[PDB]
Amino acid sequence: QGPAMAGNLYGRDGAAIGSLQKLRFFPLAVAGGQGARLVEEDGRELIDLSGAWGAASLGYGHPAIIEAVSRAAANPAGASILSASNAPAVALAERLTASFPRGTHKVWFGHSGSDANEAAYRAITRATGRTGVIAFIGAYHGCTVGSMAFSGHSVQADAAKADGLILLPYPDPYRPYQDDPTGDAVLALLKERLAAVPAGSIAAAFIEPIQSAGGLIVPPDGFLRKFADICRAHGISVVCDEVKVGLARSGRLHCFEHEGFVPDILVLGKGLGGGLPLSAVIAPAEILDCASAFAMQTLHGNPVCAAAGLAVLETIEAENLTTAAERKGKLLREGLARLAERHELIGDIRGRGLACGVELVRNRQSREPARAETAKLIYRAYELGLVLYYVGMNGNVLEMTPPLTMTEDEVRHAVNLLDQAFTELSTVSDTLVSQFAGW
Amino acid sequence: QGPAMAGNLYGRDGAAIGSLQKLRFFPLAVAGGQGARLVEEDGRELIDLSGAWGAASLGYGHPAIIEAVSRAAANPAGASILSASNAPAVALAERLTASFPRGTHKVWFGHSGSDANEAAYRAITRATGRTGVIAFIGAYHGCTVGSMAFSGHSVQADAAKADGLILLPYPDPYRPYQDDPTGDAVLALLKERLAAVPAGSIAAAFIEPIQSAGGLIVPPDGFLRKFADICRAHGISVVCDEVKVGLARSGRLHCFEHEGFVPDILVLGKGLGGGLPLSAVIAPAEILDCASAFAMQTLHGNPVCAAAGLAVLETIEAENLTTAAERKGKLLREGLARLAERHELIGDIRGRGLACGVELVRNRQSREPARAETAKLIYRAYELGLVLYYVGMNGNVLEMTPPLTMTEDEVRHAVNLLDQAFTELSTVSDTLVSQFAGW
Numbered sequence: 051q052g053p054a055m056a057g058n059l060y061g062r063d064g065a066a067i068g069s070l071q072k073l074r075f076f077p078l079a080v081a082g083g084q085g086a087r088l089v090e091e092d093g094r095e096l097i098d099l100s101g102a103w104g105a106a107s108l109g110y111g112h113p114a115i116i117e118a119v120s121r122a123a124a125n126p127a128g129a130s131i132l133s134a135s136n137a138p139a140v141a142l143a144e145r146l147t148a149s150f151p152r153g154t155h156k157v158w159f160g161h162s163g164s165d166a167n168e169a170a171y172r173a174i175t176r177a178t179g180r181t182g183v184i185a186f187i188g189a190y191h192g193c194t195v196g197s198m199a200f201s202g203h204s205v206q207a208d209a210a211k212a213d214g215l216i217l218l219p220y221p222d223p224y225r226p227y228q229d230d231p232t233g234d235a236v237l238a239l240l241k242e243r244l245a246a247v248p249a250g251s252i253a254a255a256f257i258e259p260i261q262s263a264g265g266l267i268v269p270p271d272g273f274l275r276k277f278a279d280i281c282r283a284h285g286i287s288v289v290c291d292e293v294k295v296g297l298a299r300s301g302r303l304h305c306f307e308h309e310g311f312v313p314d315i316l317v318l319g320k321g322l323g324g325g326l327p328l329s330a331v332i333a334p335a336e337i338l339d340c341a342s343a344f345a346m347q348t349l350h351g352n353p354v355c356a357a358a359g360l361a362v363l364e365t366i367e368a369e370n371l372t373t374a375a376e377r378k379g380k381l382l383r384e385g386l387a388r389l390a391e392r393h394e395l396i397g398d399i400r401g402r403g404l405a406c407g408v409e410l411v412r413n414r415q416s417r418e419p420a421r422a423e424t425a426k427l428i429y430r431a432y433e434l435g436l437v438l439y440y441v442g443m444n445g446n447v448l449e450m451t452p453p454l455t456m457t458e459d460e461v462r463h464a465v466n467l468l469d470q471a472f473t474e475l476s477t478v479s480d481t482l483v484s485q486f487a488g489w
Numbered sequence: 490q491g492p493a494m495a496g497n498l499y500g501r502d503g504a505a506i507g508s509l510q511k512l513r514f515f516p517l518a519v520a521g522g523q524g525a526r527l528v529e530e531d532g533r534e535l536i537d538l539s540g541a542w543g544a545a546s547l548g549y550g551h552p553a554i555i556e557a558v559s560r561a562a563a564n565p566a567g568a569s570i571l572s573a574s575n576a577p578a579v580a581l582a583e584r585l586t587a588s589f590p591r592g593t594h595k596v597w598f599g600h601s602g603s604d605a606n607e608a609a610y611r612a613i614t615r616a617t618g619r620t621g622v623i624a625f626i627g628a629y630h631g632c633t634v635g636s637m638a639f640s641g642h643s644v645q646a647d648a649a650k651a652d653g654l655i656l657l658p659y660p661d662p663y664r665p666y667q668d669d670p671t672g673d674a675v676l677a678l679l680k681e682r683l684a685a686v687p688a689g690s691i692a693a694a695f696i697e698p699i700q701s702a703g704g705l706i707v708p709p710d711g712f713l714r715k716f717a718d719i720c721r722a723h724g725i726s727v728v729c730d731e732v733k734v735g736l737a738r739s740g741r742l743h744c745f746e747h748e749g750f751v752p753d754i755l756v757l758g759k760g761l762g763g764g765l766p767l768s769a770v771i772a773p774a775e776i777l778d779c780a781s782a783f784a785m786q787t788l789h790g791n792p793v794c795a796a797a798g799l800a801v802l803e804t805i806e807a808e809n810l811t812t813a814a815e816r817k818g819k820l821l822r823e824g825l826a827r828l829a830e831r832h833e834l835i836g837d838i839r840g841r842g843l844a845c846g847v848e849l850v851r852n853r854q855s856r857e858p859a860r861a862e863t864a865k866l867i868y869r870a871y872e873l874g875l876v877l878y879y880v881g882m883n884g885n886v887l888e889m890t891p892p893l894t895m896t897e898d899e900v901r902h903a904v905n906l907l908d909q910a911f912t913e914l915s916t917v918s919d920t921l922v923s924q925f926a927g928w
């Protein structure tokens with residue numbers, strides 16, 4: 051790399067910021083954003099089908115986010131919820147509880163999905179005395195020591211795991227455990243694992259209602275309701291992690307609304323803040339009131355980020371974004387089915403609303419994953435003006451989680467750009483794509 | 490509590506937000522802020538001597554924070570540093586490295602002091618193979634599982650601790666370990682503890698250059714330089730946690746500038762974001778480049794919070810805030826010495842710049858701590874229109890960490906309000922103050 055490429059924004063990023071937190075697939079180097087488009091240092095525009103991993107729920111520069119953040123910065127109700135009550139945080143907590151099936155639940159605020167899942171686990175173990183926990187292989191609950199302890203994805207494979215962690219296979223309709231498409235075999239497994247440990251010893255069960263980093267996997271019909279029944283028969287708290295697929299994105303406000311059960315605890319994050327760091331736990335009062343000064347960080351519940359979160363909730367109502375996500379997700383999956391009529395690499399199209407996955411395979415009969423082709427496809431897409439990433443334990447699932455405010459015209463254009471990327475993925479050399487580590 | 494007090498902002502906070510993250514001393518209930526003043530729901534103004542635990546470095550509604558946050562919200566360079574480079578984060582990383590003694594160091598971004606200390610520990614252990622760590626009793630490095638593992642304060646007393654943690658007494662001039670005012674006894678202790686464990690087994694040593702939650706303790710002259718010499722003789726990385734006392738507050742830009750040594754790693758947070766969630770690690774490249782996709786959260790390096798951090802650094806230069814903090818801290822400690830000529834409860838006045846502590850005792854000869862009187866004093870202060878909190882393992886140290894932009898006139902008025910609070914602390918009943926748990 052010569053001095054011009056070293057001196058550009060991507061080169062500067064390599065010299066100034068450590069690799070420790072990087073997850074890079076192509077040399078995306080951003081200086082601005084407007085609507086559903088990113089703008090690079092050189093001025094090139096790109097359509098963002100990733101929506102910053104679902105964080106950009108209202109896109110970039112939405113008037114309701116500008117209004118809220120500018121107003122709170124000019125007259126901030128202090129900087130915290132720890133040693134003061136503040137008006138924006140309390141208003142946000144009452145709006146979140148009103149959205150969840152009155153009187154029984156309170157809120158905890160954090161910065162991230164990692165800190166929220168960690169606080170939910172510590173609180174249950176403090177309040178019940180129980181130390182064990184159930185979660186899934188492929189599950190992504192965070193990237194801190196406390197949240198990696200009950201995760202199951204490759205990012206957390208070398209982390210220290212909780213005492214009494216029971217890790218189960220997540221039932222995948224495309225690759226079913228024990229060749230049982232229903233998931234009943236995973237339920238029977240859970241019952242056997244509970245019998246090998248002392249009774250009443252499990253505090254909690256963490257579940258994603260659609261596994262995202264694990265592969266954009268929607269579980270079989272009725273599995274999650276049956277799983278939640280088992281847990282309730284053993285006195286185990288059911289924690290629904292909606293950090294990625296929550297808050298209108300599924301075509302219902304809360305993803306569990308598709309699944310015929312109500313969890314004990316709901317965890318929120320990513321698009322809750324609209325581009326600012328904001329997470330929440332909605333839990334029984336007895337769980338969140340078992341201690342004080344116990345799980346706290348100084349800027350938790352700051353009024354700037356709370357104002358952004360109130361703007362996201364208000365805009366979901368005012369712009370009818372739950373219905374929009376349902377309608378636009380149908381249009382996107384219809385487009386992708388037309389591409390599958392010519393591109394044999396597409397093996398499966400799945401998801402809910404504007405949480406969509408397309409699984410790439412070397413052959414439709416064998417279902418053998420196509421990792422190398424997936425990495426080149428998204429590189430070619432980036433060259434053509436479209437940003438998307440891949441997920442899954444085999445690296446072969448394209449993920450689409452656009453801003454909820456993406457237009458229909460933008461959805462159609464993105465499908466057309468993807469068609470070209472499928473046709474021309476082999477134009478990206480082996481040597482170029484190997485400069486990006488991915489996951 | 491009747492329905493009017495239940496329906497006010499503090500009552501609403503009790504019904505909607507769990508106690509789990511609360512650290513409350515009096516019923517402070519904020520709806521706005523301007524300069525160094527908070528405004529409650531009812532419209533009452535208070536002068537904020539806590540500066541939101543040091544987070545409000547530029548006070549409330551500072552024009553440079555309004556400009557930066559409003560500009561970035563209207564044209565945001567995406568939402569993250571993980572899967573994209575972005576211009577505000579890279580500019581902030583280059584400004585932070587330029588401030589630290591060229592070529593050798595890079596940056597990691599987080600949301601909090603907790604996540605920054607955790608990432609520094611994981612990175613060293615990954616890059617060196619070493620698992621052991623040195624820290625201090627009373628040390629506060631965070632409130633997450635990964636950061637509590639090498640903390641020493643009462644908040645973290647029941648947390649799981651790292652394998653190979655060596656916890657040492659922090660040398661306090663007012664209460665010296667082994668009756669040695671120099672701290673040489675703590676240095677000799679460290680040498681013995683290193684001899685009982687395998688050679689080259691310690692990864693890191695974490696130190697606060699002024700212990701804040703531990704009691705606003707400035708260590709004896711030359712201790713920290715000698716400690717850093719020992720660590721370097723054993724190949725141990727020296728991590729200086731300046732989350733609380735960093736970035737101009739001590740009267741030097743970096744607190745270690747008072748102490749005659751340069752650390753290997755510098756950790757920053759709190760006032761770095763000016764009221765938004767922002768932390769940083771400045772570390773050798775080989776430490777931060779040992780892995781990718783390793784310590785990452787989705788909103789890390791978001792452009793709104795990075796723009797706020799660039800505004801804090803720029804304002805420290807433009808308003809000459811390092812010199813201001815030195816000058817105003819002298820004025821504050823001179824005022825407090827005048828109060829000690831009439832209020833026998835004051836046993837010691839200490840600190841650097843605008844990081845000040847006043848230790849309250851039942852008798853000046855015995856030095857017996859005065860916990861109950863300290864809790865009533867800050868309650869009375871709150872009634873009179875002044876916000877401050879207490880710290881220390883014995884609950885008897887008043888902490889003052891005001892906005893760097895507090896005026897001299899505001900400092901004098903705050904001293905006058907404190908004089909009245911000392912005179913009238915006994916007017917706060919036992920039953921009233923016991924409704925607030927504190928720490």
Ligand SMILES: */C(=N\[C@@H]1CCCCNC1=O)c1c(COP(=O)(O)O)cnc(C)c1O
Nearest residue numbers: 103162163164190191192291293294786787
């Ligand atoms: C977020 N999951 C990952 C995060 C890192 C980037 C790769 N893409 C993903 O979608 C997440 C979290 C953790 O939230 P945090 O990153 O803000 O700490 C927790 N739970 C779920 C389900 C997800 O997706």
Ligand SMILES: */C(=N\[C@@H]1CCCCNC1=O)c1c(COP(=O)(O)O)cnc(C)c1O
Nearest residue numbers: 347348542601602603629630631730732733
């Ligand atoms: C911050 N310390 C505590 C934080 C909780 C409120 C009580 N007052 C204090 O000053 C801190 C941290 C942790 O940063 P975080 O709260 O943003 O996670 C880490 N290191 C130091 C030295 C301090 O003070």
